[PDB]
Amino acid sequence: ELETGRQKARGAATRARQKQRASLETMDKAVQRFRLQNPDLDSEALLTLPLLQLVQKLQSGELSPEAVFFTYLGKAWEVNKGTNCVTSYLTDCETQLSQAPRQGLLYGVPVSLKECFSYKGHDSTLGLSLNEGMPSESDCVVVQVLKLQGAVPFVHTNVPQSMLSFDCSNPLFGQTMNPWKSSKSPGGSSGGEGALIGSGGSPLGLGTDIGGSIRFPSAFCGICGLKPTGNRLSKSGLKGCVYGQTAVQLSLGPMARDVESLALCLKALLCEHLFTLDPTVPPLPFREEVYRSSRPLRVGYYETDNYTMPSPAMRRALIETKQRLEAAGHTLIPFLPNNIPYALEVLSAGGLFSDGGRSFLQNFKGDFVDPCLGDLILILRLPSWFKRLLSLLLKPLFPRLAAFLNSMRPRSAEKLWKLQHEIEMYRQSVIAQWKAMNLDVLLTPMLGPALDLNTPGRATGAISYTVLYNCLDFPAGVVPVTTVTAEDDAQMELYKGYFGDIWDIILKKAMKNSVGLPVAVQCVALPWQEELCLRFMREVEQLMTPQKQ
Amino acid sequence: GRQKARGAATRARQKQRASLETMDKAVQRFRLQNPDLDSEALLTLPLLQLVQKLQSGELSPEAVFFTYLGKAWEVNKGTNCVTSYLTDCETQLSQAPRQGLLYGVPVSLKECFSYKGHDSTLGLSLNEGMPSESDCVVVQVLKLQGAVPFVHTNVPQSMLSFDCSNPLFGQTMNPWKSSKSPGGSSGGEGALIGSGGSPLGLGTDIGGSIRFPSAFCGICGLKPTGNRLSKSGLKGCVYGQTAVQLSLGPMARDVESLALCLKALLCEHLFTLDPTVPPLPFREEVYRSSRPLRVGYYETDNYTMPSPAMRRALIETKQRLEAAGHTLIPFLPNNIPYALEVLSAGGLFSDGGRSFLQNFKGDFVDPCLGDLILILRLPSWFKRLLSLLLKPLFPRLAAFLNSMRPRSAEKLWKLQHEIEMYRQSVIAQWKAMNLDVLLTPMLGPALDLNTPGRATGAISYTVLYNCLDFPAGVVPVTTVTAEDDAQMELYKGYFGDIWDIILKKAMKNSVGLPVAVQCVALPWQEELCLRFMREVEQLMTPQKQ
């Protein structure tokens, strides 16, 4: 196919960057006009309040919806100067401020949206040139339900190009940076949400997750998030670059400063509004008594998946939370899901690249390839025979690289059926394993601390803690527990990895210079048991960081 | 290479013979020891009253079990629907949980519902002599709810048919007319329940397998949303096909029995034993509701011309629904030919049926399957060649034959996304008209034996709602009058191809056969679908309530 150059892509970028500048300029001029009429307002007293108190003050009338909106809008503008997390300001959000239903459970709460969520008259670019100049006709289902619950969506946050990366850079809107350290990644693909919420710019945000896209940004930026069962929320109206892929399940969920906020958001979304607008979502209301329950829990755990070697901080975080849960009265049981290498190398990789990434590569024609994507584009473009040959060559010395590369080959519809059946069986397998040890819930090390910029796309193996539960389709949440100590960073010199392939070499360098950065833990429950998962997350939060309760 | 098949067929016939002999000796023992017991009053009792007398202790579980077992054995003589007698039942009978909602209730299972120590042959050789080492999930919950599964019921070969014959156990017959097919693939269940051999049964449905036998034999059936109930442990031909949703559901004499069955399944035990199933309890408030309904309806899908019996059945219920204060609204799903020919056909045969064909290595092809097997065996270049050669003459056959060609994984995604968009487009219409529920004709009456496999276009009324993945249920509303049967001489179809020809002959000579109607609701609204079925039953056959 004839080369079309980069001209159309270059023009798109400048247009996108302008829409970015104009958004920020409108925000600034809107908040300066508010402060010229309300100098009395205390910003810091407002901005430090937890979402639960904030929302109940909006209800009591002690705080006006205009006050909370323009303070957070101002905070958002300020944190954006150092992080670059906002791509667009939602123009007609001020008309929503006045229309907001007073009885709505999220009344007057400013909510941030990952760019993939479509908003009327706005681009969902995904960092992809061919998607710019393409305003959405409608608000997507979840946006509509947020609005109906009194919430105020106000910003689109940055993604990495295409969203198939856990970094946060794209040739259109640039690179998002971690609010704790300029050199570090905020995570991805919901990275903008991580940088914004993490630095106090938003009390609540929404992201998507297919391989760790909610949990990576949450852990890297020291906030918490929840990836629920795939079809617990409406996926309707969401921009993606590949459609009709059901093997590995894509899901969306809340990201917030504390877990109590997450359970509020989940309760707000799970209502008649959602179930009517998207009838394909099972009408499962938020089970309150399960979330509030204070019974002792049988908690499974592991210190390592025996695939990606945890950092000393990850290991330390896991053991510390494991020990404090035993002291709390919970029974802790060693548990490790069988055949993890299988789940990732053939089930996950194969489920995401069944077509050999052909449909995926369509979005990159005549476009730039952002450096934060690594060689993923270069590798996927190679012919099937070359992917096979290279895989066989690599198999003796580099086993991980071999199996991943082989699964990125196109197969028939027949072999897709086989694959989807094998995922169903593996799901049944881990559930059986789960029940035999009679677990309530599961505790997992969460990848951390934040990796250096432009490294995540070169260390794919690190998704082995997150993508496992998109494949299994289990509700999985992430909660911050500790920060990197000086002792933790020194031990990184004595980090070898389990395989010693080029992924481990890059990951060893990426986690250095990380003192004072946050490290999180992962909480996992059985499918449809997100209220159980939140209850467990609430416990973990209470024992590790009790300031948030 | 037919030695294996002849052996498998011989062995299966011995097991079926011994199954029936065990049954006979068991019922003769109980009848002689309990001669005082009134069997006739027992069998005509509606299931709701039957469990009520069982929970109160007015009737014993031993009483209801062997009374039904005797009837099952007797009706089997004219239908050939029982494939196997599940011997564990007699010990499980004594060990039934007293608190269970289905305590002492005998349940009949389709052969694909795997039961410990028994085969799920599906009419294939390669599955004979391979007993299940485990009860499937739904079978477990039934037992945990006090139910007693007693028999395995016959299916057409490979289960991809709405007839009911296989080389192992032979042909199943409609309990109303010997020359008629009982429908399929839950054909055994249709015949058994249809003549009072069982109060309750379980079937599967990929394209009408619950709704065809229920309509043909004159009983109630429900096809829920694919994943409302646990599919774990079910035997099938091809695994991993998710585009067109496979569903399982109850089959019984009245809709009240279906609701009681669904309430029993939608419990703690099902959700614990299969956590992949969304824990949606049975919403009593919805099923029991009596608010007027905005009812969508159509008399024809403009793809398969309904029989005069069908058309009358549709309008009559529509009329009584209007008379009962329900507002009736003309409604038709968009692009039905597109949904059948490219989506539904392509969904089931994305791989050209290669995986389906593997089960037929060295096996007999039952006449009831028609030309399906040799048509699939054709190479894709030749499937394509015939496709656009037949295109000018018979578009239906041409568009089906093309959709039975192998695709790449890339092409499946494209097709899966088209199914997701179509599902959203039909919902968009549904909301635009503000519908509660949808009324649909149900292909009937029963077709003659060996013609369902030669009239593939007749799946139109059923398969569409597997493609949409909507809860759909049938309720018998009328019977074929000689007047209706006479008008079948004027039936032409919309295309006049062989599918229209075979169907014209097959539906003839049907006086006295049951005609049903179809109730459709939105995904996960099974209890609303049952509420509608309850209404349709009450207005058309008030004696059932």
Short mmCIF file of C-alpha atoms in Angstrom, two decimals, chain A residues 231 236 242-247 275-285 287 350-360 362 410-418 420-421 424 427-428 431 435 526-529, chain B residues 227 232-233 238-243 271-281 283 346-356 358 406-410 412-414 416-417 420 423-424 427 431 522-525:
data_model
loop_
_atom_site.label_atom_id
_atom_site.label_comp_id
_atom_site.label_asym_id
_atom_site.label_seq_id
_atom_site.Cartn_x
_atom_site.Cartn_y
_atom_site.Cartn_z
CA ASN A 231 -20.20 -6.32 32.03
CA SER A 236 -21.98 1.41 25.34
CA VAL A 242 -10.69 -2.40 17.82
CA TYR A 243 -14.29 -3.68 17.95
CA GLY A 244 -15.87 -7.14 18.27
CA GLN A 245 -13.16 -8.68 20.45
CA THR A 246 -14.75 -10.61 23.34
CA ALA A 247 -12.01 -13.09 24.38
CA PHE A 275 -30.30 -0.61 33.24
CA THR A 276 -32.86 1.15 31.01
CA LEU A 277 -30.38 2.93 28.70
CA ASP A 278 -28.34 -0.26 28.27
CA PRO A 279 -30.53 -3.37 28.83
CA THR A 280 -27.55 -5.64 28.00
CA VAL A 281 -26.22 -4.90 31.50
CA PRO A 282 -27.63 -7.28 34.16
CA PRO A 283 -29.81 -5.27 36.62
CA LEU A 284 -27.61 -5.98 39.66
CA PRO A 285 -28.02 -3.27 42.32
CA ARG A 287 -25.49 -4.85 47.66
CA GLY A 350 -3.90 -14.52 21.90
CA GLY A 351 -7.20 -12.97 22.95
CA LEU A 352 -5.95 -9.45 22.20
CA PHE A 353 -4.11 -10.24 18.95
CA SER A 354 -6.21 -13.04 17.42
CA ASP A 355 -6.17 -11.27 14.05
CA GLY A 356 -2.42 -10.73 14.45
CA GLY A 357 -3.15 -7.09 15.29
CA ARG A 358 -4.25 -6.31 11.73
CA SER A 359 -7.38 -4.37 12.78
CA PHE A 360 -5.27 -2.69 15.45
CA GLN A 362 -5.39 0.09 10.74
CA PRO A 410 -3.34 -14.25 12.84
CA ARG A 411 -5.49 -17.37 13.18
CA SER A 412 -8.75 -18.70 11.73
CA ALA A 413 -12.24 -18.32 13.21
CA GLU A 414 -11.91 -22.00 14.14
CA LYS A 415 -8.83 -21.40 16.29
CA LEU A 416 -10.55 -18.39 17.88
CA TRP A 417 -13.39 -20.64 19.05
CA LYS A 418 -10.82 -23.02 20.58
CA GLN A 420 -12.46 -18.64 23.77
CA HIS A 421 -13.31 -22.12 25.05
CA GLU A 424 -13.84 -20.37 29.72
CA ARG A 427 -11.89 -19.41 34.38
CA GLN A 428 -13.69 -22.53 35.62
CA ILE A 431 -12.72 -20.83 40.39
CA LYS A 435 -13.39 -22.94 46.15
CA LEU A 526 -15.04 -13.62 42.42
CA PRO A 527 -17.05 -12.40 39.36
CA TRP A 528 -20.00 -10.11 40.25
CA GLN A 529 -18.72 -9.81 43.82
CA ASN B 227 -26.12 -16.46 30.78
CA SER B 232 -21.22 -25.40 33.04
CA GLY B 233 -21.24 -29.15 32.41
CA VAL B 238 -18.75 -27.02 19.23
CA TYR B 239 -17.31 -25.05 22.15
CA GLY B 240 -16.23 -21.40 22.07
CA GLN B 241 -18.95 -20.10 19.75
CA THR B 242 -20.17 -16.95 21.54
CA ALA B 243 -21.60 -14.82 18.71
CA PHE B 271 -24.46 -18.56 42.26
CA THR B 272 -22.03 -20.34 44.60
CA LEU B 273 -21.59 -23.32 42.25
CA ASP B 274 -21.17 -20.99 39.26
CA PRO B 275 -19.92 -17.47 40.08
CA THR B 276 -19.75 -16.58 36.36
CA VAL B 277 -23.55 -16.39 36.54
CA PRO B 278 -24.75 -12.89 37.53
CA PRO B 279 -26.56 -13.32 40.89
CA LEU B 280 -29.93 -11.94 39.73
CA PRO B 281 -32.54 -13.42 42.08
CA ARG B 283 -37.91 -10.89 40.94
CA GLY B 346 -22.41 -16.72 9.95
CA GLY B 347 -22.31 -16.88 13.75
CA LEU B 348 -23.05 -20.61 13.85
CA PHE B 349 -20.75 -21.40 10.92
CA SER B 350 -17.81 -18.96 11.27
CA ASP B 351 -15.35 -21.82 10.71
CA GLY B 352 -17.32 -23.34 7.82
CA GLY B 353 -18.58 -25.96 10.27
CA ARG B 354 -15.20 -27.75 10.42
CA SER B 355 -15.46 -28.21 14.21
CA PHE B 356 -19.05 -29.41 13.84
CA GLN B 358 -15.38 -33.56 13.29
CA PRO B 406 -14.73 -20.32 6.80
CA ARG B 407 -13.56 -16.88 8.03
CA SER B 408 -10.39 -15.47 9.58
CA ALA B 409 -10.33 -14.35 13.24
CA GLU B 410 -10.27 -10.80 11.85
CA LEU B 412 -15.20 -12.99 13.16
CA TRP B 413 -14.51 -9.82 15.18
CA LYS B 414 -16.15 -7.83 12.37
CA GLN B 416 -19.29 -10.09 16.35
CA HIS B 417 -19.32 -6.27 16.26
CA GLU B 420 -23.46 -5.95 18.89
CA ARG B 423 -28.62 -5.74 19.10
CA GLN B 424 -28.35 -2.02 19.89
CA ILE B 427 -33.18 -1.97 21.37
CA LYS B 431 -37.26 2.16 23.28
CA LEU B 522 -35.47 -7.39 26.76
CA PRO B 523 -32.25 -9.08 28.04
CA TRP B 524 -32.34 -10.17 31.71
CA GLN B 525 -36.11 -9.56 31.87
#
